[PDB]
Every structure is written in C-alpha cells, then in structure tokens.
Amino acid sequence: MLTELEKALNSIIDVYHKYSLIKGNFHAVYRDDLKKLLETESPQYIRKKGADVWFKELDINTDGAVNFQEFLILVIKMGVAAHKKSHEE
Amino acid sequence: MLTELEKALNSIIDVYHKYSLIKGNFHAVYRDDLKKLLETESPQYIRKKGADVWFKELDINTDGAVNFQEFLILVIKMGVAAHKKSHEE
Amino acid sequence: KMSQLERNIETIINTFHQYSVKLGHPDTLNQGEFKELVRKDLQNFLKKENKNEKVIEHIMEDLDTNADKQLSFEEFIMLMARLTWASHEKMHEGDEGPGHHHKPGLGE
Amino acid sequence: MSQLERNIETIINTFHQYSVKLGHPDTLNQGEFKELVRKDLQNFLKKENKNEKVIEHIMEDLDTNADKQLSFEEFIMLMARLTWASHEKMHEGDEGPGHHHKPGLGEG
Ligand code: NA
Ligand code: NA
Ligand code: NA
Ligand code: NA
Ligand code: NA
Ligand code: NI
Ligand code: NI
Ligand code: NI
C-alpha cells in the first residue's frame, strides 16, 4: 500500500485527468477546461487572478492547451501559496 | 555519432550549465546568472523584456533560482518566437 | 470545503511540516529530517533510491537551490512535482494506445 | 548568433525540412514525423523507433491541437522532453559530490 503522501501525488494526477479527458488530446486542458479546473479545484485567492490570465501563463508553448507539465506549474504555485498562508496564522 | 539535431539538444544542456555552474547549487541559475545568460545567449527581442521580468516568469517555485526545467521554459519560448521570426519580413 | 486538489496540497504541506517543525514553530528540513521523510513517506516512490543513502543525500543537494544545507518548502515542493510527473510517466511507459489508460504508477 | 540561437535554429531547420513536404507547410503529418524521428532522432529514440506503434502514440501525445498533425509549437515540446531526458540520463543514479555528466541519451 502507498503512503498518504504518495496517494496525494497520484491523486494530483487524477485531478488533472478529470479535465484533460473532457475532449481532444488526452493530456491537454484547453482554455474552457482550465476555467472549470480553477473554479472547482482552486481556492478563491487563486481563482481571483482570472482563468484567462492563468491560461496565458501556463500555455508555455502557446499551442492553445495546458499539458500535464504545465499543470504542475499551477500545482507548484498553489502549494507555495497555500504553505505561505498557513505560515501566517 | 549523434545527429545534428541531437547535438543541438545536448548543446542546450551545455548552455545552461555555463551559467548554473558559476556558483552555488549546480543546477541553479540565480538572478545575476540569468541576466548574463540573457545578455549572452538570447536575441534583442528576447532581452528587451528585462532580466527581472524573465526571472519572475521562470522562478516557478519562487525559491530565488532557475533550475534546468525552468530554463527549458525559456528555451521553448525562444524557440516558438524564433520560428515566428523566420516567417516575418 | 476543500477540493480534492487542495487536500492533496494540504497533505504535502503537513508532511513537510511534520519533519521540519522545530519547537512547535515551522522550519526547514535538514538532511537528517529529509532522509526520514523520504524513508517513511516515500518508501515506495523512492524504494530503490532509499537503498543507497548517498543517492538520497545527492537528491537533497540537488534540491538545495539555496545552498544552505536546508530545504525550505519552496525547495522541497520541486521533488513533489518531479515525483508526480514520474508517476504519470510510469503509468504511460511504453504506451501504444489507442485511447487513454493508466498502468500502475511509481512504487507499484 | 549565440550557441543557444544556433541550437534553436537547428531545431527550426530540421522541423521545416519535413513540414514543407506534404500538406500544410508548417505542420508535420504522421509520416513526416516518423521520418524525422527515424533519421534525426535515431539515437535519442533508438528503442522507440523499433516499435512503430510507440512512435504513433508519441505523435498522438504531442498532437495537443487534436488535428492529426504537429505544428512547431506542438513539436518543440518533444525537443524539451528529450533535452530533459538526456540531462536526466547524465545524472542517472548520481551520488555526487560535485557536478558531473555521464553520457546522455543515445549512449553518446
Ligand atoms: Na483534453
Ligand atoms: Na501548451
Ligand atoms: Na548555480
Ligand atoms: Na526556481
Ligand atoms: Na506539412
Ligand atoms: Ni495520463
Ligand atoms: Ni514554419
Ligand atoms: Ni547537470
């Protein structure tokens, strides 16, 4: 059996595929898919940047999609921000 | 012998290490290292954004350094931009 | 309430804090604390690496971007992203399709 | 032009050599992608080149636009992945100390 930390990492994979498997390329989250990901999975202080602002930041190769590596950029930034907020209370 | 394309990919690794091996962590390009990297390796239309703007965009985990994966963000953006430039007057 | 993604990030933060905490206050992971986290909570994802203590120490050195023999959370979370990426790559190792399917990931 | 610019130029020129052949001048169809991989990535993708089904699924994975062809934006992600994979090969099982590169991808 995997540990709780290891389960959390595999669960992050599953979270991404809930949106990447909606349509098109299996490992591509398009702009409208990213909007739903942000609205469902991220807290308000992350959503407040705007889905279009996040999408432009994450689509590194400007191909109109966010792949899994680019999604991990969002995960890293969400984690650093969540740690910082927990480190202020 | 590797092909010319394969040599180009390995040369991109060598470019990063010219600056990441300057000081500190072997796979970290710090703010002053990135400014030298941009001034030496990238064309004017890339440099004009400014080293500080590039550094903020590349330092995904906001740890004060650019690692090799974060450097590949710059390579991807330089490559896409250079391809568009090849089709312009 | 928290989303699935928020809970996963919370698990990462709390696991980091369980080994870094110093006199009840948040801190950083030294090499000894990093090895204990890796030995226990990444015993499957880093099963082979855990057999070589020098390999674990060099992973610490590679992540120690601040060159202070300590892993802040910012330094540590890069390992979490790499292992998440590696586990997904394991799910698609030698994939021929068609369609999307995940084989077992890291440590399985 | 700098070393990095020349490397990027090599990537662009190689892509263009195959994308001009058939269909749209700035995309690779599957046949041209296989030819590029077979010739210009014969070492970096040596094992994958032995299984045509694997090459076709790499194409499908890179086809983020879901249009059965690779624009340069889609193709350059393969270049970043192979560059990363080669550097990971140079540090495979690294114990340190210091920084050292073993031979990279393609045993070169
Ligand atoms: Na998709
Ligand atoms: Na993209
Ligand atoms: Na450095
Ligand atoms: Na960084
Ligand atoms: Na074409
Ligand atoms: Ni997948
Ligand atoms: Ni073109
Ligand atoms: Ni290296």
Side-chain angles (χ1 to χ4, degrees), chain A residues 1-88, chain B, chain C, chain D:
Chain A
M1 180 173 68
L2 301 175
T3 71
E4 291 304 317
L5 179 62
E6 296 167 337
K7 287 176 179 177
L9 300 190
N10 282 342
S11 172
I12 291 172
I13 297 171
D14 290 340
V15 167
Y16 173 79
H17 285 73
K18 292 194 309 183
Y19 306 92
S20 73
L21 295 177
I22 292 177
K23 63 176 179 291
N25 180 280
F26 301 133
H27 296 137
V29 160
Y30 305 98
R31 188 183 302 264
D32 62 324
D33 302 322
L34 183 66
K35 178 182 270 296
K36 287 198 176 184
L37 189 157
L38 289 163
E39 289 169 353
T40 306
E41 311 291 343
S42 72
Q44 183 274 337
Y45 64 88
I46 296 293
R47 304 190 301 259
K48 183 178 178 58
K49 182 190 285 185
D52 287 334
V53 180
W54 270 116
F55 187 85
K56 187 183 185 189
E57 175 191 327
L58 298 178
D59 182 12
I60 298 299
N61 66 337
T62 53
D63 69 349
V66 169
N67 65 19
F68 187 58
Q69 316 93 267
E70 296 166 321
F71 166 73
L72 289 179
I73 293 171
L74 172 63
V75 175
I76 290 167
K77 288 190 173 187
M78 285 180 58
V80 172
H83 174 257
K84 177 182 177 297
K85 194 168 295 285
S86 294
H87 189 284
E88 295 174 356
Chain B
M1 178 141 80
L2 300 175
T3 70
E4 290 303 319
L5 179 61
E6 297 167 337
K7 287 176 179 177
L9 301 189
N10 282 342
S11 172
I12 290 173
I13 297 171
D14 288 336
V15 169
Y16 172 79
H17 286 74
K18 291 193 309 184
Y19 307 93
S20 74
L21 295 177
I22 292 178
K23 63 175 179 291
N25 181 281
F26 301 129
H27 294 138
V29 160
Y30 304 100
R31 187 181 301 269
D32 61 326
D33 303 322
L34 181 66
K35 181 180 181 65
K36 295 190 181 61
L37 189 157
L38 289 164
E39 289 170 353
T40 307
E41 310 291 343
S42 73
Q44 176 58 40
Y45 64 87
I46 296 293
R47 303 191 300 259
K48 71 183 182 184
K49 183 190 285 186
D52 287 335
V53 179
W54 271 116
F55 189 89
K56 186 185 185 189
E57 283 169 10
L58 299 178
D59 182 13
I60 297 300
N61 65 337
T62 51
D63 69 349
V66 170
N67 64 18
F68 188 60
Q69 318 114 235
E70 295 167 321
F71 167 73
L72 290 179
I73 293 170
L74 172 63
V75 174
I76 290 166
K77 290 190 174 301
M78 286 181 58
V80 172
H83 171 253
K84 178 180 179 61
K85 285 284 194 292
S86 76
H87 296 304
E88 296 175 356
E89 296 297 323
Chain C
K1 207 169 179 56
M2 289 181 300
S3 68
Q4 180 181 358
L5 180 54
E6 287 178 293
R7 296 188 186 88
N8 299 332
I9 290 174
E10 181 182 53
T11 297
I12 296 171
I13 293 170
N14 286 339
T15 307
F16 174 89
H17 185 59
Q18 290 174 16
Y19 297 94
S20 65
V21 61
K22 184 161 72 185
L23 322 129
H25 293 90
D27 205 14
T28 62
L29 301 172
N30 61 33
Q31 189 180 65
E33 294 159 346
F34 178 73
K35 292 167 171 185
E36 186 185 3
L37 187 158
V38 170
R39 175 173 62 252
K40 295 181 177 179
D41 296 292
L42 296 173
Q43 58 183 270
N44 307 290
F45 275 26
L46 293 174
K47 183 181 177 62
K48 181 182 78 171
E49 297 83 345
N50 264 309
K51 301 176 181 178
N52 191 332
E53 187 170 5
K54 293 293 187 297
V55 169
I56 299 305
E57 297 176 349
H58 195 63
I59 294 175
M60 166 100 180
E61 190 64 30
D62 181 58
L63 295 165
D64 181 23
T65 55
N66 204 70
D68 55 0
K69 307 298 176 181
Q70 302 280 333
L71 299 188
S72 66
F73 182 80
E74 290 86 349
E75 287 159 296
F76 172 82
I77 198 172
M78 297 309 297
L79 178 64
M80 302 294 94
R82 288 175 189 169
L83 291 178
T84 302
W85 158 261
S87 188
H88 183 239
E89 292 285 295
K90 184 67 148 48
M91 300 176 181
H92 291 282
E93 191 178 37
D95 200 348
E96 298 182 16
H100 176 273
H101 178 258
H102 281 165
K103 301 181 181 172
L106 272 185
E108 292 185 294
Chain D
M1 24 183 317
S2 69
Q3 179 182 358
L4 180 55
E5 287 177 292
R6 296 188 307 263
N7 299 332
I8 290 174
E9 179 183 53
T10 295
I11 297 171
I12 295 170
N13 286 340
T14 308
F15 176 87
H16 278 157
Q17 288 170 13
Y18 298 98
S19 67
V20 70
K21 292 188 175 185
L22 298 165
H24 184 272
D26 236 343
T27 65
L28 301 173
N29 302 115
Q30 188 180 256
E32 294 89 64
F33 177 74
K34 292 168 171 185
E35 186 186 4
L36 189 159
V37 169
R38 173 171 59 86
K39 294 181 177 178
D40 297 293
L41 296 172
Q42 59 182 267
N43 306 289
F44 276 25
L45 292 174
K46 182 182 176 62
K47 182 182 78 171
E48 297 84 345
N49 264 308
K50 301 175 182 178
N51 191 332
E52 187 170 5
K53 295 293 188 298
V54 169
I55 300 305
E56 296 176 349
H57 195 254
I58 294 175
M59 167 99 179
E60 191 64 30
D61 191 51
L62 296 166
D63 180 22
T64 61
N65 295 16
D67 53 359
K68 307 298 176 181
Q69 59 207 265
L70 301 188
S71 65
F72 182 80
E73 290 86 350
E74 286 160 296
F75 171 82
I76 198 172
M77 296 309 298
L78 178 64
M79 302 294 94
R81 289 178 191 181
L82 291 178
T83 303
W84 146 269
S86 188
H87 183 238
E88 292 285 295
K89 184 67 148 49
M90 300 176 181
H91 290 282
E92 191 177 37
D94 199 348
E95 298 184 16
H99 177 273
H100 178 70
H101 281 166
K102 302 182 294 182
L105 225 45
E107 203 175 355

